[PDB]
Every structure is written in C-alpha cells, then in structure tokens.
C-alpha cells in the first residue's frame, strides 16, 4: 500500500568498446522499469542527427567493379572502405558536394579528409595507398538523414550517372536492446533492473546517443509544464 | 517535430481528452504509451482495506437485523467508491446505524471520508436492530489483495478486503494523422470521480518524471 512507486536510484554507465555501451538503472518496482525502457530504446534510434555519403564519382573509373592502374586497392575495395569512414558536415547544411584530390606516393586516412565542408569523426581510418605515377581524384556527396536509404532511391534523386550511387546507413545508433532483471530492495523480490545495451557506429559513442535520446523525452514531457 | 501545444477538455467531471501536438509520423507512442499505462498503475485512489462489524467474527457469518448476510454486504461495500477528505492516507472510520433503514453512498459522510457514488446501494437494517462497523480506508496506487492486508494488520478483529485502488476506469489513446504532415496524440480518461481526469494525468506525469530521474546520473 503506497501512494507512489519507488523512484529508483541507482545508475550505471559500463563501456564495453568506443561503440558499445551497457547502461543499468534501479530499483524499479515491476513494470516501471519497462514503462520507461521500451519508449527510451525507441528514441535512441531518432534522437540523433546522422550524416552519409551517398555517392562518389572517380575520375577515370566507370563503375564500382572497376579498377585504377595506381591505387592498390580496386574501386570495389576503396569503396568498402569509404562506407567505414563517419563523414560529418561542418555548420546546419543537409547536403555537401565535396572535391577531393591526392597526389604522388601517399597513404590516405581519414584526417586527411577534413575541409572546410566535412570532417571524418573516425580520422584514424584507413582509406587507399595511391603510388608516385598517380592521381586520385574524386567528388563526394555527403547528406544529412535519418534511417536505411537503398541506392536506387539516391541514384534518382541525385540526377547523374557518372556518380555511383551509395546504400546509406544514417542512423548513429544500429542496436539498442534491453533486458529487465529481477533484484531485491530491502529483501523483497517485486523490482526490476534496466539493462540498457546500445551500440553505434561511431558517428558518435553510445553515452551521448542516450543522453539525446534522454533530452527528447524531457522535450515531449515539456509541453505539459502550464497545468 | 517535437509537441507545442496541448488542450485539455473536460467532456464531464469525471471524463477529459488530453490533446497535445506535433509529433513526427510514427514517435506520438513514446508519450502515449506509457502515459497510458502509469494512467492505470500509477493514479491515486482510496479503498477499504479492512472492515469490523460488531457481533460478527467472519466473512460467512449473518447478522440479526440486516437482510444481508456479512458476505453480500461485502459485495455491496465494493462497488461504493470512497474518498478520504483532506490529505490522510487512512481513516479507521466508526458508523452507527439503527431502526428501518436502506443505507447508500450518501450516509456514509462524516468528517473523515465520503462516498462518491452517493445512490450505491449497501444494505438494509430492520426495525429495532442495529448496524455498527469500523472500517479502514486508505490510499493507495493498483490493487492489493485480502491476504496481504489480512498478514500486514495481523489482528483477528477485522476481516481484510480486497482493495482496489485505482481510480481511473479507462485510459486509451488514439494517434491521427494532419495533412508537413504531423501526428496528434490523444488520451482519454475516465475516473470514477475519486479524483478528477486531471488530477489523475497530474498522478501520470509526476510519476514519469519521478521514474526517469535515475537516468539523469548519465551527466
Ligand atoms: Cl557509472
Ligand atoms: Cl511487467
Ligand atoms: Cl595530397
Ligand atoms: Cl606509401
Ligand atoms: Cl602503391
Ligand atoms: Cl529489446
Ligand atoms: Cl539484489
Ligand atoms: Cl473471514
Ligand atoms: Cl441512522
Ligand atoms: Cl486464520
Ligand atoms: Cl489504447
Ligand atoms: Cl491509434
Ligand atoms: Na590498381
């Protein structure tokens, strides 16, 4: 017999990696753990602005399969390792159209593609080798998003065969699961614990993907503030 | 999107429809859905916890005088829905009936509690008899059962009830769609006028925050 739930007090933030996060609260009085963990793990995959490229056209390469006498990697390969780099857009634009362009014997991370438009969050990433005889130039769209977008709807809006259409993965957060343990509060056995379990991709750490997430619930909730 | 504006419009005194706008398409369920539910788990209400009739020892028994037998005057005692005026978590409350009498909602007022439902029916007394009972009444969130009552007062004296406590009798929610296109989140609520539908959305909203405030150790 009580008026209120107890309000829980204990909090936990564990770093698994740079990417994966385990973040427990308690002691909830069952159900009141899951009141709060289903909407929560909701808002981690739309609490946060995330950024892509979405397609690259390479001078002198026709399309994805094909190769470029002076860089070690074939087209296919530098482009797997294009989709591993976390491009974000320096200032509130949606959309950059960004030159690159590299010369002589050169290894490419990503530090080395920061510019006044983008900036690589991921800078220790490897790109491609070019060797001394060559030239690596290439134009990339960056955009800002939400969500899965396939190839095929990017190739038609962006307008323009002679650059390759990317599958683009906005999201920050790709995995955000929960598990509600039983624990005891002065001996008896009816709360809960949240485990919170919430993986990126680097565009940013799990930590501030919760605490976006955290601050758009105190966003909804406020517009009830005037009784 | 994110909501701006809300509306509050009470249909009755014991009904209201809470309206609160723009949300994104498809993110109005993380307000409704467990607004919805603290809605029913977490509103403030009374009930009888326990009650002692003089003469009687249990549930079973009869009672010279009544036309109810103690079990059927329990049935009846349930569905009248009290209120412990002020601001007391319980009142052990006396009441003192005699002569021919058909007893309701309404006789049951003094200066502890009330019922609500004022022309509930609860029993009737004969001539040249007389009904007196003490009960307990409390307040309280969800419902708890006889046997933990009956366990925690640990005295033979009083026969342990079922208490309900929850006063709202329905909550629902129903999301639309405005044509830029936005979505509107409504809940509905009804309580058996224990307390007001907004008194109840408040009992919603402090407890969420209550309930969220663990996680703000993140920072
Ligand atoms: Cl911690
Ligand atoms: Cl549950
Ligand atoms: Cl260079
Ligand atoms: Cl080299
Ligand atoms: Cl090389
Ligand atoms: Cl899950
Ligand atoms: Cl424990
Ligand atoms: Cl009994
Ligand atoms: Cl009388
Ligand atoms: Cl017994
Ligand atoms: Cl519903
Ligand atoms: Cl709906
Ligand atoms: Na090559």
Same mark, same amino acid.
């Given at each position: 017999? #009580?008026?209120?739930?107890?309000?829980?007090?204990?909090?936990? +933030?564990? $770093?698994?990696?740079? #990417?994966?996060?385990?973040?427990?609260?308690?002691?909830?009085?069952?159900?009141?753990?899951?009141?709060?963990?289903?909407?929560?793990?909701?808002?981690?995959?739309?609490?946060?602005?995330?950024? @892509?490229?979405?397609? +690259?056209?390479?001078?002198?390469?026709?399309?994805?399969?094909?190769?470029?006498?002076?860089?070690?990697? !074939?087209?296919?390969?530098?482009?797997?390792?294009?989709?591993?780099?976390?491009?974000?857009?320096?200032? %509130?634009? $949606?959309?950059?159209?960004?030159?690159?362009?590299?010369?002589?014997?050169?290894?490419?991370?990503?530090?080395?593609?920061?510019?006044? *438009?983008?900036?690589?969050?991921?800078?220790?990433?490897?790109?491609?080798?070019?060797?001394? %005889?060559?030239?690596?130039?290439?134009?990339?769209?960056?955009?800002?998003?939400?969500?899965?977008?396939?190839?095929?709807?990017?190739?038609?809006?962006?307008?323009?065969?002679?650059?390759?259409?990317?599958?683009?993965?906005?999201?920050?957060?790709?995995?955000?699961?929960?598990?509600?343990?039983?624990?005891?509060?002065?001996?008896?056995? !009816?709360?809960?614990?949240?485990?919170? #379990?919430?993986?990126? %991709?680097? *565009?940013?750490?799990?930590?501030?993907?919760? *605490? $976006?997430?955290?601050? @758009?619930?105190?966003? *909804?909730?406020?517009?009830?503030?005037?009784?």
């Amino acid at each position: 017999i #009580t008026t209120s739930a107890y309000t829980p007090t204990e909090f936990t +933030i564990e $770093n698994i990696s740079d #990417t994966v996060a385990k973040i427990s609260a308690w002691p909830f009085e069952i159900g009141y753990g899951i009141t709060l963990a289903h909407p929560l793990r909701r808002l981690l995959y739309t609490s946060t602005i995330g950024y @892509a490229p979405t397609a +690259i056209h390479i001078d002198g390469v026709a399309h994805e399969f094909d190769s470029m006498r002076g860089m070690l990697e !074939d087209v296919a390969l530098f482009i797997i390792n294009l989709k591993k780099l976390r491009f974000k857009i320096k200032g %509130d634009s $949606n959309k950059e159209i960004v030159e690159f362009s590299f010369k002589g014997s050169k290894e490419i991370y990503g530090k080395d593609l920061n510019n006044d *438009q983008v900036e690589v969050v991921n800078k220790d990433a490897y790109l491609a080798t070019i060797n001394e %005889d060559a030239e690596l130039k290439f134009t990339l769209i960056v955009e800002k998003g939400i969500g899965y977008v396939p190839s095929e709807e990017i190739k038609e809006l962006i307008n323009d065969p002679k650059f390759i259409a990317l599958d683009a993965f906005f999201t920050p957060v790709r995995e955000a699961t929960y598990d509600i343990e039983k624990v005891l509060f002065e001996d008896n056995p !009816d709360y809960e614990k949240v485990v919170l #379990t919430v993986t990126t %991709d680097g *565009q940013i750490t799990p930590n501030e993907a919760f *605490q $976006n997430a955290l601050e @758009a619930m105190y966003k *909804q909730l406020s517009v009830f503030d005037k009784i």
